Design a protein around this ligand. Structure first.
Ligand code: OGA
Ligand code: OGA
Ligand code: FE
Ligand code: FE
Lengths: 341, 341
């Protein structure tokens, strides 16, 4: 019942198990499986409408990209610049660079580097070819500069299916598609995003651990003005139960995605994403949409995510009103001690 | 230097000390004196402009009322209804009756009773004449229904002086004049008001203990939606240092006012008001003015009182946004734990 990602699937044509238990990292909390369903299955429509995650196995969303790999993409993607994140651990914490102004004691552990696709490939290879232990993770928004064969792939994505989704759920516009290409073992630690995400897996296998927005009190996000806004403060490999006691009560939903699977990551749901150990490189492309417009009159009882939005806005307005984000904390405490705690 | 109210003053004509040390209650914190100055003294103007308290000894503000007493007021004040607060302790905690909706576990210890001036006097007297231990405190806004001799007194207040003050400080309009008539030993426990107050003493002696708005963290006001909004949770006679640890650090300003003295109580300053033990009944009339309009662009550094206003507004908006004031607390805590504390 806490079966996490379940018994690994069998590759077609008796090519054996897709992955095994030992490619997954070990964590302190339990999880139950995300459902894997066909896009024709009305349970899947039901899950998406209710803003619960579902892995869809047959959308054909990025069918033309399943041939993508490093060689094919070097050949075809253009001479635009790609953002490449760097790290000396498997954990790639990310920084909002605009917020770094306001936190001096904030030297960064994952630096961005702009480079050309060929350079990233070279750099990956002189690491492999020399056995160094650094890690890279290309994360770049698909845009104008990409070459023609890639623009044809893109155009062959299943827009008929995803636009009907966008229409049915009343979401806003497609804000972007992020192209992600990681090394085996890379982790994107637990965070939430404020848009709806269809997360289309292309090459390799990723274990995705999701927590509902109602787990906010177990995951201890950073302050909103901090550069790690929206990321959990808890180190999942070494959790500090003294600072984060409710992380002892956290319960997640997990799954392992491979080529052709699309994971719906609903807005505000926490997600922790790991490229399987010793599984080769991973490729994914996501689809971010603004969420449906927020309705005319509030309907009680509020959803968890709207309480999350409320907290964010309190922190943001208070930061503006005090003229300094560093004063948010002291004031919030003055507000609650001996009054609300 | 912590001399509190100082060596008691001598009544003119060798009528002896106005009051003595033993008419004052004993409390845990230190205090320093509020200055007593003449309204001609430019230090007093300076204090008022800077929103610091000053006792003015010679304004003649309510000179025609110094003849007021129970007999004169029964004779002359009309047949309007007077609010009379009741209590079985010296401590008169007050309730905002509109806020009682939202706190069920809120039976009240000081009930209001409407009555005619003659009834209040009778009621005082059958207590005196029978030696019961209940306490009353008439607190009523001066208005239309008062009789002609009282309206003449009123008209003879020193409007020339107080309107020039109102003009010079850019305050808004006179919102009201509260008439207060207390029994000896009555206490109004520590609270703040959001208007500027000239507090004109008429009969008897009151010890006024003020704390600056920056003592908010030592005085632990009730939640804003509570019926005791703006009052301190701390019982000054039996202070709970485990719930209110910073009450151990509180420092106040004190003074003893008598007939003819006017105490400026600046907006947001905490005040605790006690009618001296065994000093007879007290009479006071206050003058409440809306504070100056809040300036176009905020000027950093903010004043303490503006941080207080900011806290109030957070509590109020959050109560509206959640649809229930009882959820304010839980959410504020969820917001700060493991994030800002
Ligand atoms: O794929 C990853 O490692 C990170 N992806 C996301 O967090 C996302 O798509 O929102
Ligand atoms: O005089 C009292 O006992 C109470 N007065 C006040 O709190 C006031 O004038 O604001
Ligand atoms: Fe994300
Ligand atoms: Fe008051």
């Amino acid at each position: 019942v806490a079966s996490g990602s379940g018994e690994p699937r069998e590759e077609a044509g008796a090519l054996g198990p897709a992955w095994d238990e030992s490619q997954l990292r070990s964590y302190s909390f339990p999880t139950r499986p995300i459902p894997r369903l066909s896009q024709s299955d009305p349970r899947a429509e039901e899950l998406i409408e209710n803003e619960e995650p579902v892995v869809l196995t047959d959308t054909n969303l990025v069918y033309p990209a399943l041939k993508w790999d490093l060689e094919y993409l070097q050949e075809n993607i253009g001479n635009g610049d790609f953002s490449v994140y760097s790290a000396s651990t498997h954990k790639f914490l990310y920084y909002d660079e605009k917020k770094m102004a306001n936190f001096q004691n904030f030297k960064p552990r994952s630096n961005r580097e702009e480079m050309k696709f060929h350079e990233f490939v070279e750099k990956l290879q002189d690491i492999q070819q020399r056995g160094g232990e650094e890690r890279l993770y290309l994360q770049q928004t698909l845009n104008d500069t990409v070459g023609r064969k890639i623009v044809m792939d893109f155009l062959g994505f299943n827009w008929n299916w995803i636009n009907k989704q966008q229409g049915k759920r009343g979401w806003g516009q497609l804000t972007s598609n992020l192209l992600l290409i990681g090394m085996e073992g890379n982790v994107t630690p637990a965070h939430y995003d404020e848009q709806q995400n269809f997360f289309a897996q292309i090459k390799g296998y990723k274990r995705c651990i999701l927590f509902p927005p109602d787990q906010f009190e177990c995951l201890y996000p950073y302050p909103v003005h901090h550069p790690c806004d929206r990321q959990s403060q808890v180190d999942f490999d070494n959790p500090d139960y003294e600072r984060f006691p409710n992380f002892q009560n956290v319960v997640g939903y997990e799954t392992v995605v491979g080529p052709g699977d699309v994971l719906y990551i609903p807005m505000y749901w926490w997600h922790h994403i790991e490229s399987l150990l010793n599984g080769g490189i991973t490729i994914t492309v996501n689809f971010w949409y603004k969420g449906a417009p927020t309705p005319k009159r509030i309907e009680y009882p509020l959803k968890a995510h709207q309480k999350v939005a409320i907290m964010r806005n309190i922190e943001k307005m208070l930061g503006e009103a005090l003229g300094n984000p560093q004063e948010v904390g002291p004031l919030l405490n003055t507000m609650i001690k001996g009054r609300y705690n």
